[PDB]
């Protein structure tokens, strides 16, 4: 029937056109824009390249082979064509695994992120992915390490006009694990913690702020009052014996620290110190009305003062807390600069005052870079957390999971999987290459770049 060909002709061409136009726009956006050249976007460029070569060489010949029902481009070029298809899917999915690891690595340890991931270490990751992708698709095919299972399969290889997909048990499972199952469990476990790490996204901003204002020390340091503290202003014990400071540290940490702890262990002690401090702000009758009127960023600035002076010291600003409850920011910024706390730590009080003025993360450059990547990936609340993380994992799942499951089950029992269903489920995987430009490019700079290249407003 003419209709079904036309239907395939218009649907398959739509997928080709949508994949190409989406990837070309993403590639040309990062190329002709300077603010869009972040190190996080250095990895998404490999995602679009692995997806553009898909829509330019893999998807087009995928539709041409189905419509004509026979290959008409030589057998070597089909071995070449099959190689590109696997090389791109491997380079696409493994890049999706890199994108998830990259954005998680910056959330947990933000300070190290700007120190390790440079231009060299960014290209090495992309180089390693395409090398792993190239060594699992091209070389096993150019060496004929996949075929020769049955007598029937041999005939289609010798014929220069026949080209189907017949692989043995070894390459069918090995390629599926390297391409899909290894990046799957990683992306599943990474986003499982990303959703868990975002459950306290308000405390993480306070942690990175107090690391600049107060200061994190992994080793036990004596305080000015003569007592031993650890991490960020966390008192170990008021006894002047260092032996008691080690035993108290072992109980809260849970191991033999001998004085030295790690970053995440001090960060977990920070969560107990904040929850014990926020309850104190709600406990004090003078700090609760101020806390109810402050926004999220200024609530952290109020807790910043509690970690330095305490609920007794923060309550000592009758004029400032009075204007904070009345939402008078610029007036409260002057009376805070007149107190004794501003005179002893002017560089810290200014950043706290600047936070109370604008309500942004200004004067904390690293923390402001966090809010952009946190909201882009997670969002604000429970309704936004499962939504954004769900569609990023849902699109990657519904496209490639039904194929590789069918691909692996086919090796279990022959003739159990229909060929037409096998092609459709592989084709559903291609559509994921067209969705990625509209999934990972939701950055504010991407929105500015996309609306400018299309002459929008
Ligand atoms: C050539 C032909 C003929 C009929 C139907 C489809 C096709 C195209 C083919 C099968 C080459 N698509 C490759 C498929 O996207 C794919 C991607 C990554 C992989 O790791 C594997 C994989 O195939 C199974 C596997 O074990 N590994």
UniProtKB/Swiss-Prot annotation:
GO biological process assignments: adenylate cyclase-activating adrenergic receptor signaling pathway; adenylate cyclase-modulating G protein-coupled receptor signaling pathway; adrenergic receptor signaling pathway; AMPA selective glutamate receptor signaling pathway; bone resorption; brown fat cell differentiation; cell surface receptor signaling pathway; cellular response to amyloid-beta
Membrane topology recorded in Swiss-Prot or TrEMBL: Multi-pass membrane protein
Lipidation (S-palmitoyl cysteine): 455
Protein modification: Palmitoylated. Mainly palmitoylated at Cys-455. Palmitoylation may reduce accessibility of phosphorylation sites by anchoring the receptor to the plasma membrane. Could be depalmitoylated by LYPLA1 at the plasma membrane. Phosphorylated by PKA and BARK upon agonist stimulation, which mediates homologous desensitization of the receptor. PKA-mediated phosphorylation seems to facilitate phosphorylation by BARK.
Compartments in which it is found: Cell membrane; Early endosome; Golgi apparatus
Major subcellular location class: membrane
GO molecular function term, any single one: beta2-adrenergic receptor activity
Keyword check for Electron transport: no
Alphabetically ordered keywords of this record: Cell membrane, Disulfide bond, Endosome, G-protein coupled receptor, Glycoprotein, Golgi apparatus, Hydroxylation, Lipoprotein, Membrane, Palmitate, Phosphoprotein, Receptor, Transducer, Transmembrane, Transmembrane helix, Ubl conjugation
List of residues binding (S)-carazolol: 85, 175, 426
UniProt GO cellular component terms: apical plasma membrane; ciliary basal body; cilium; clathrin-coated endocytic vesicle membrane; early endosome; endosome; endosome membrane; Golgi apparatus
Ranges per topology, Cytoplasmic: 31-43, 102-122
Modification Phosphotyrosine occurs at: 113
Taxonomy, superkingdom: Eukaryota
Effect of residue 455 to A: Loss of basal palmitoylation
Extracellular side: 68-78, 147-168, 413-419
Disulphide-bridged cysteine pairs: 78-163, 156-162
Transmembrane segments: 7-30, 44-67, 79-101, 123-146, 169-192, 389-412, 420-443
Family per record: Belongs to the G-protein coupled receptor 1 family. Adrenergic receptor subfamily. ADRB2 sub-subfamily.
Quaternary structure annotation from Swiss-Prot or TrEMBL: Binds NHERF1 and GPRASP1. Interacts with ARRB1 and ARRB2. Interacts with SRC. Interacts with USP20 and USP33. Interacts with VHL; the interaction, which is increased on hydroxylation of ADRB2, ubiquitinates ADRB2 leading to its degradation. Interacts with EGLN3; the interaction hydroxylates ADRB2 facilitating VHL-E3 ligase-mediated ubiquitination. Interacts (via PDZ-binding motif) with SNX27 (via PDZ domain); the interaction is required when endocytosed to prevent degradation in lysosomes and promote recycling to the plasma membrane. Interacts with CNIH4. Interacts with ARRDC3.
Function: Beta-adrenergic receptors mediate the catecholamine-induced activation of adenylate cyclase through the action of G proteins. The beta-2-adrenergic receptor binds epinephrine with an approximately 30-fold greater affinity than it does norepinephrine.
Protein name: Beta-2 adrenergic receptor
Protein source organism: Homo sapiens (Human)
Organismal lineage: Eukaryota, Metazoa, Chordata, Craniata, Vertebrata
Gene: ADRB2
Shown chain mapped onto the complete sequence: 29 to 343 of 413
